[PDB]
Amino acid sequence: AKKGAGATRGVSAVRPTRALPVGAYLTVADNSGAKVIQIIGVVEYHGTRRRLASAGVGDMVVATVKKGRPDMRHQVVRAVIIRQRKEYRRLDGMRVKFEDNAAVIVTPEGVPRGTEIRGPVAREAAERWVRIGSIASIIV
Amino acid sequence: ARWNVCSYCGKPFEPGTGKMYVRNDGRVLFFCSRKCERYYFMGRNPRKLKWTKAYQEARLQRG
Amino acid sequence: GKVHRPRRGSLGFSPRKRAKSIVPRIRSWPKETEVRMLGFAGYKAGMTHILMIDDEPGLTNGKEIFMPVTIIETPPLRVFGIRAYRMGYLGLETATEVIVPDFPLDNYPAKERKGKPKPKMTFYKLLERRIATLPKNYTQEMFEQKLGQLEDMIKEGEIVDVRAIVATQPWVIKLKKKPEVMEYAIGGTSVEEKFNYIKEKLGKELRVGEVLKEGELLDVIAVTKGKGTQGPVKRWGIKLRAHKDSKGRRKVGSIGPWHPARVMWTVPMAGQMGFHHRTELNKRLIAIGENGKLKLDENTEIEITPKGGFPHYGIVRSDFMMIAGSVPGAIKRIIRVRPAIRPPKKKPPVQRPQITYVSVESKQ
RNA sequence: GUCGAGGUCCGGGGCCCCGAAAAUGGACGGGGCUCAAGC
RNA sequence: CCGACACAGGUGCCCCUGGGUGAGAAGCCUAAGGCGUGUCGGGGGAAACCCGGCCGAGGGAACUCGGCAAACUGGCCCCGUAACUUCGGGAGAAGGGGUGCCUGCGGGUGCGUAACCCGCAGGUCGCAGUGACUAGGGGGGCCCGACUGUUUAAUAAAAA
RNA sequence: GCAUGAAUGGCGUAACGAGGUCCCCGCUGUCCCCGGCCGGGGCCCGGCGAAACCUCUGCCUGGCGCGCAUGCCAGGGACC
RNA sequence: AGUCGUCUCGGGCGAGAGCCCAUAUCGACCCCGAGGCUUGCUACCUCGCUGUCGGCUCUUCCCAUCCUGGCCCUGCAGCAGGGGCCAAGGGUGGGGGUGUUCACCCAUUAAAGGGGAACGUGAGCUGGGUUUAGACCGUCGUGAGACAGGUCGGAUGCUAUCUACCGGGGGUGUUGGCCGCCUGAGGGGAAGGUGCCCCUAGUACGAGAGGAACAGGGUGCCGCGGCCUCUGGUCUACCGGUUGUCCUCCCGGGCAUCGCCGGGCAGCUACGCCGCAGCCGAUAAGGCCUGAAAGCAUCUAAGGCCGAAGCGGCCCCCGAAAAUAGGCGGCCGUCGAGGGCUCGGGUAGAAGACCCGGUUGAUAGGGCGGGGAUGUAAGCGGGAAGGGUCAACCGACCCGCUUAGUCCGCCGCCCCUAAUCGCCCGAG
Ligand SMILES: [Zn+2]
């Protein structure tokens, strides 16, 4: 088996609703330097005529930094969504919801560019990305 | 196969229904319906509603 | 081409007209070796949900998952006819058919209304509500002589197929009195064995437990819910016109080019929506109940009917099937099921799965 | 250098073949036709 | 009455208007007076679709020539208020806090415990107290014309 | 400065504007992606009851043709 | 419309460049062609009117193929590239400035192909540009004024006559009428298409760097057909709170968008949930066997075997008007089966049609019981910040009887009421 422990990606049994289209503003939950980002695209997604790309918990998006340190503003980066306001179903049939739309800035491979994550991290995102789960302090 | 207990009316609801709300500070609440969720978030007092389990505690509180 | 998008709607379900008959027809049958009737009929009861340990292949294997189920009540069918098919120039032709003579009805739920005794129903009295012209002075001797003639033709070898004619029994569940008549094919590779099976079951009652296997896949045939006339936006899912449009928004923009100088049949248009003949494939059979009860662990049995009864439906009283998912049709609709005609290579094991919870809470 | 009957080239004449891709479905007038019902 | 009409226009709204709320001849309710003749009726889950309204989860202009349409704000009291400037203004800039009902006091003019208005303390309910009705969205650059005003009655209101 | 310019005025300008234009906060069904509900039409039934328009007619594919034919040529379909 | 100078595309010779080697790749000079997708030329039809560019909506077609499927040569080690062939079933998206087509740019993507349909589509829409009438600037003109030079503003008419397509009905015919179940000529379909992940595997290959494939598992996205258990929206049924006013006050009500606000079952819905076979047959390019013409050789001349997301079948939908106008069991006729209207209701619905019930009865109503939505009614008793002669009485609000009261377009049991009387086709 390749990359037994160095793998940066995983799989999840739950698929959260894509409640965040292109143009949504996400709060940065880590200390990489950014504070607010805007979605300008969703990777690994094919749309259709006049359809905006949408992402949910555990999805990777391409975003432009709006607020943060001077060396981070106006920069195109990759982020992984860890919390969303739109409730989504889990295996037991129960719906889970969060308080805000929050994401963590990571490299395209999936290695976070920060060292601390604020607030809970969705179990789906933690399973999808091992590094995010490893660095997360609260997972629910 | 566990009956979650609503955080507003203090009653159990069947598996496959309801929802869980996660707060930023890390705590979790369970809501059996949109009615209970909306009342909790608006701030309606559950100790004054006879159909909630908190009313029994309030009755013991007063006497 | 500048911008490209897939066509709106499917042309493979045209014409989108009202179904020919409210009783669904089955055009094709599964090929099987086991000598059994290929399918069954029942009445839609409602929907609920269960929690079970998944067993089919996937990531969620061995884990507790949520699954919706449709409960359909299935009072036993009465096998009352046998039909034989020979080969014609262009296709199968009906060589002959024979039905049993009239017999007393021992499952009619008669109630002793004040005045007059119990009605004392008999067959050919519930059946005349559907056929309306039944044999007169029909006796067992002539019935047996007709059956013998049919067997003699089978021996001669001009009969290529045989089917069983059955009728529903709504009066048992007190849904209605008018029965519904259908014919079902039989599995196996010998017409003589199929005929012997049907002959043994002639005039008797047949239950789901004797034909269908728990945990196997099926195909469900029924007539969908009626929606009446609907516009193109809902019928074909076209795009709404721009909000500044002063000639409406829920209509197609252009219904064709200059040439050809005609409106093509492929342009979305308003018309009948719903009440269509449809077939859904690969619906798993979760469980078969008896007398409105489900046995879970051989120690606790629960009544499938939710508290307050099924909305728009009564109380389940007879055998019922729990199909995994949704089925076409309205409440009380007649729904037919056949063994899967097109199953996947990898399918769930043929057995009832492990059910951990059944929802019997009020659904209204 | 052993077989053992015509070989190896060149310029020409007739028919055919390749070179030969378009948009509503369809044009030898049509069916169709092969020692022709073609030349 | 005029417009071909028992015309949703114009002439004439030319003169006049109880009670409550309220700054108000505003909106809403109501007394007087008037009307059911802004004169074709009946049926219906009886559709599609069109005009006029009410709400819509998550995102918030990604739509479009262009935030077109809709939406936000909205009354009153208190604090607070920028660049610029012709010193007049900008200005209700911007922005922030309060608002219900009930029980008692203090104050102004007043002969008065008549009438109107202004504060204070306490108790209390709701998601919401200008609870309906009434009722501004705001800020920063550039071009043109100083401003109020006038214009193609019937496609141009503008820098003309 | 292809081809600005000082009374057919030059430059600037506070206040003003249903003038033209760019940006930001807030807002929102403009949009992702459309879904429900209400009143009036639409629909059916009983009455009063016109007008615009009208050579006669009125299915198609390839063609000939004043070069883009329901009506012609050869074919294909079509019960009212 | 004609033509193809021009435009797009293709071909012939092979100088020359490629370490040697014209043809892995490029192909000078010159010569022969296709298309009608750019522009031009002609003036053939239309000036008693065929309404412009762009955009939105929607349908369809061509291949000179951008991706997806299958292959050939290579200056093809692998991963990749360059060139060519078969193949049109499927896909070919989202944004910034600009009216823009186009071109440029951004982040994704398997790819983000070019074109025809009166430069498809205004009795479908929008009106940003073009192109009237108003006005400003530059230049030209003595002037009126002009500019394929800029700029602000500037109208989009319709009761469908025929045909066409979408659905819905009444008839005749099918060698007498009726009912019930079937067969399946013929038509339609994309009902499916396509990424990524684990393993094979740090393996084949390679000096290293780097780095595959067959097979086996999982899952996303787009498309299609269904359903309302769950979640969300709505829910002018319904319950509660409250503002102004009126019915004298209490209770209880009218109006003010449903007065406004919160919640809301049934129904309808999506943002929710479920379902969508990879196997046979023949083939295209291409890879081969046998084999002569041409004693050898040769995939082709005769003969044979494999071989594509393409073609046909399995699968789904319509289908006895399928003119060879079908089969079968039953019932009737030579009075009469079988129907229609009328009656009580929706598994249905614009009219028609369709389904269940009709005293062989639980179809609707009524009564009772179950399950629900709101959220504890009126009345009485007590407390209450206080005031009151600190007395009687007034008092927002609170507590108990009280999971109350109200209501139910959901279900079960009970014939208490209405499903009655009656009328008309109907083969011979
Ligand atoms: Zn609760």
Side-chain angles (χ1 to χ4, degrees), chain C residues 12-69:
Chain C
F13 294 80
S14 286
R16 310 234 175 174
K17 63 187 284 290
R18 307 192 181 167
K20 193 218 176 170
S21 177
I22 200 167
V23 188
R25 82 178 293 195
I26 307 189
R27 298 185 167 96
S28 184
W29 297 99
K31 298 293 183 182
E32 293 179 353
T33 298
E34 181 178 12
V35 189
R36 88 189 158 150
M37 182 179 72
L38 301 172
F40 210 87
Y43 298 95
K44 194 161 157 166
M47 285 192 76
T48 58
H49 72 255
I50 59 154
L51 273 77
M52 64 153 171
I53 308 302
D54 187 349
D55 54 5
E56 52 187 278
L59 264 290
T60 76
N61 194 318
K63 292 181 181 179
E64 203 174 26
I65 63 170
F66 175 98
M67 179 93 69
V69 301

Side-chain angles (χ1 to χ4, degrees), chain C residues 173-233:
Chain C
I173 57 163
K174 291 161 52 150
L175 188 74
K176 56 196 184 183
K177 276 76 72 183
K178 184 164 166 196
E180 293 179 353
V181 170
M182 296 153 260
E183 75 180 43
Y184 281 87
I186 316 299
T189 45
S190 64
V191 177
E192 183 178 1
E193 187 58 22
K194 298 160 75 167
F195 158 88
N196 283 319
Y197 169 100
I198 297 174
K199 182 193 163 122
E200 183 178 2
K201 292 184 182 294
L202 283 174
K204 302 290 183 289
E205 282 188 57
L206 183 65
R207 299 163 72 177
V208 290
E210 312 173 26
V211 286
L212 292 175
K213 299 291 180 68
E214 266 174 334
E216 82 182 351
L217 298 164
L218 308 162
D219 307 321
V220 187
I221 309 100
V223 176
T224 71
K225 300 165 61 146
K227 308 287 183 68
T229 310
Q230 295 297 336
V233 161

Side-chain angles (χ1 to χ4, degrees), chain C residues 1 4-5 8 11-12 16-18 27-28 49 59 83 85 92 94 111 113-114 129 131 133 174 177-178 225-229 241 247 254 259 270 279-283 333 338 342 362:
Chain C
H4 300 90
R5 55 145 183 77
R8 308 283 184 192
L11 291 174
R16 310 234 175 174
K17 63 187 284 290
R18 307 192 181 167
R27 298 185 167 96
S28 184
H49 72 255
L59 264 290
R83 167 169 274 184
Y85 284 92
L92 289 174
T94 317
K111 64 192 281 184
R113 262 178 207 87
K114 296 105 169 177
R129 310 180 92 102
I131 308 297
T133 49
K174 291 161 52 150
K177 276 76 72 183
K178 184 164 166 196
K225 300 165 61 146
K227 308 287 183 68
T229 310
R241 284 146 75 155
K247 274 206 190 180
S254 78
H259 280 96
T279 305
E280 293 179 353
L281 315 168
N282 300 328
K283 301 286 191 180
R333 183 81 78 211
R338 74 187 173 192
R342 185 181 147 182
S362 179

Side-chain angles (χ1 to χ4, degrees), chain A residues 1-2 18 46 48-51 78 86-87 95:
Chain A
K2 281 210 189 304
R18 314 186 94 119
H46 294 107
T48 193
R49 172 65 173 161
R50 277 171 64 173
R51 170 163 299 171
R78 301 288 189 86
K86 182 72 167 149
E87 69 275 16
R95 263 62 178 180

Side-chain angles (χ1 to χ4, degrees), chain A residues 16-124:
Chain A
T17 307
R18 314 186 94 119
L20 295 160
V22 171
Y25 281 86
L26 296 173
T27 290
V28 183
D30 53 11
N31 56 351
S32 158
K35 298 293 183 182
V36 179
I37 53 166
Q38 192 189 34
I39 305 177
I40 61 161
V42 190
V43 300
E44 293 179 353
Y45 175 85
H46 294 107
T48 193
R49 172 65 173 161
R50 277 171 64 173
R51 170 163 299 171
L52 298 183
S54 285
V57 164
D59 282 325
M60 166 159 279
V61 296
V62 192
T64 186
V65 183
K66 318 294 289 189
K67 292 181 181 179
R69 307 191 306 220
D71 54 53
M72 288 295 288
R73 297 209 40 181
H74 312 296
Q75 184 178 182
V76 182
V77 290
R78 301 288 189 86
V80 163
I81 308 184
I82 57 163
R83 303 201 292 277
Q84 76 181 46
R85 271 199 192 115
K86 182 72 167 149
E87 69 275 16
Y88 63 88
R89 178 178 80 153
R90 288 189 164 177
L91 291 173
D92 60 29
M94 194 178 69
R95 263 62 178 180
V96 71
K97 191 167 71 173
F98 293 90
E99 183 178 1
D100 69 353
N101 307 293
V104 161
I105 301 193
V106 310
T107 63
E109 313 91 38
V111 190
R113 296 174 69 187
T115 316
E116 310 194 38
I117 295 171
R118 295 289 219 172
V121 174
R123 184 73 94 198
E124 293 82 3

Side-chain angles (χ1 to χ4, degrees), chain C residues 344-355:
Chain C
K345 282 169 319 195
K346 307 163 66 60
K347 64 179 74 66
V350 190
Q351 65 183 357
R352 188 202 272 205
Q354 184 178 2
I355 312 186

Side-chain angles (χ1 to χ4, degrees), chain B residues 6 8-9 32-33 36:
Chain B
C6 183
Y8 188 81
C9 60
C32 66
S33 50
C36 278

